[PDB]
Amino acid sequence: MKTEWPELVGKSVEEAKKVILQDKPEAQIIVLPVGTIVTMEYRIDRVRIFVDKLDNIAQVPRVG
């Protein structure tokens, strides 16, 4: 199962959403600022993306 998208570092949200959905059609994509205090249970259909001030992906999106 695809669990990580290193290829999306530096891309916009729109492009990250399009690529994650091709690879993971059930994905629930959640957009958060870098540095967000996160304690969350594991959800296998969720993909969190952490974004910078210009809404570019700052780190490697991962399932969870």
Residue-range domain boundaries for the chain = 1-64
Distance CA 37, CA 25 (A): 27
Q: Distance (Å, rounded) from C-alpha 62 to C-alpha 48?
A: 7
- Method used to solve the structure: X-ray
Closest CA to 38 of 50, 55, 28, 29: 50
3-state class (DSSP) for residue 29: strand
Long-range Cβ contacts of 31-36 (<8 Å, 24+ apart): 31/55, 34/58, 34/59
Rounded distance between C-alpha atoms, residue 41 and residue 53, angstroms: 26
